[model samples]
Target: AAPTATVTPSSGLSDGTVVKVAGAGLQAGTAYDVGQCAWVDTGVLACNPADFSSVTADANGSASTSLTVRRSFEGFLFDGTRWGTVDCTTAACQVGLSDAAGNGPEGVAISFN
Candidate 1:
């Protein structure tokens, strides 16, 4: 089943914040994280949890992660070569899932204020 994800306090500002990521209908016994906000020029459009805090799913395919959001964060986008800039406040942050390969998935999106 495709995973469904959500975050608490779906919006925030700089100066460090805390967030909880909960996922359901995911692959059992696997790791996932809140990915970064991403977009691109081609079909390679994707995002993953680059905000840290890798969590693993349970036997029933559920998982959650806790993280600290850096206040001085400058949102980024991967251009397949170098990372570009994103206006998190304007574009918002996406909460995605990754294979825990350092957190990167376009699962869900959370607003960054």
Candidate 2:
């Protein structure tokens, strides 16, 4: 079974704030979906395997990572495959899975601005 993870902002995030997204259960060497607020736009951010920060998983088999916000929008969502961006300004967004293999968590939502 695939593990589940959540990407969120560390702190001190603002417009154009470069925040880190920490999560676990991620497939190494794979590009996880990332974005500002919600998955409404076509813009998608990719996670570099070489640039990912390390974390220690607990007994629950979960891990964490630090990612940058890159751009300002609303919220973020990960489908264990692809990522979607939402417009925080409008509070409207959608999410979906990627056409890749080994993508778990099916459809996960990030609840934060």
Candidate 3:
């Protein structure tokens, strides 16, 4: 089954917001990392590696974590450029889960304030 993700306090977000992301329907006993980034219909524009958190799915295929939100962060852009600034206050930022093994389906994206 495709994994799903949800974020708490998903609206009215700003700098320093502490958002919690929960994942479900994932592979049981698997490890994953959750992160925030600016997103578009095509794909993600930028993602800060420093903003990621790791979690291991329980026997029930569920995990959760909380992270501090940065309205702006430094990361690489889609163009392979270095040191790009992603501003969530202006762009749409989302939280999602990634497989720790570096391969597999990613969790669904959930937007935050």
Candidate 4:
């Protein structure tokens, strides 16, 4: 089954929101990276590479992590060729979990107030 995720206080995000995220039905004992991203038709588009966390799924295929994210962040894309802006108020923001290959198959949408 595909993995599913949950985020605490999913909405009304503000500057420096301490978020708790969890995942289930993932590959047991596997490592995953968590980040704030845009959940798109292509799965997930990572907003900032610097703002991230890592976790390993438990034996039961459950994973949990915490992150402190802001309403807006600054960065550059792939190779710094283009500017990348992470503004939840104007983007399809979500907290996502992905493997080493950057495939975040699951995420939970979040919004700024």
Least lDDT summed over 10 consecutive residues: which range in candidate 1? 40-49
lDDT winner among the candidates?
4
User: TM-score for all predictions?
Assistant: 0.68, 0.37, 0.78, 0.83
lDDT of 1 by residue, 42-76 (tens): 53433432555677789998887876654334444
Question: lDDT by residue for model 3 over 24-103, one digit each (tens)?
Answer: 88889988877776764475457777777888889998988887777788866646565567776667676777785554
Write the number of the candidate with greater TM-score, choosing between 1 and 2: 1
lDDT for each residue of candidate 4 in 1-113, tens digit (9 for 90 to 100): 77888989898778887899898888899999988765333633536666788999999999989987778777444445335566778777777888877665666888888
lDDT of 1: 0.58
The weakest ten consecutive residues by lDDT in model 2 span 90-99
Residue 29 local lDDT, model 4:
90
Instruction: Answer with 1 or 3, whichever has the higher TM-score.
Output: 3
Which model, 3 or 4, shows the larger TM-score? 4
Deviating ranges (above 4 Å) for candidate 1: 40-50, 70-80, 100-106
In order, candidate lDDTs are 0.58, 0.38, 0.72, 0.76
Provide the lowest-lDDT 10-residue window in model 3. Answer: 103-112
Better candidate by TM-score, 2 or 4: 4
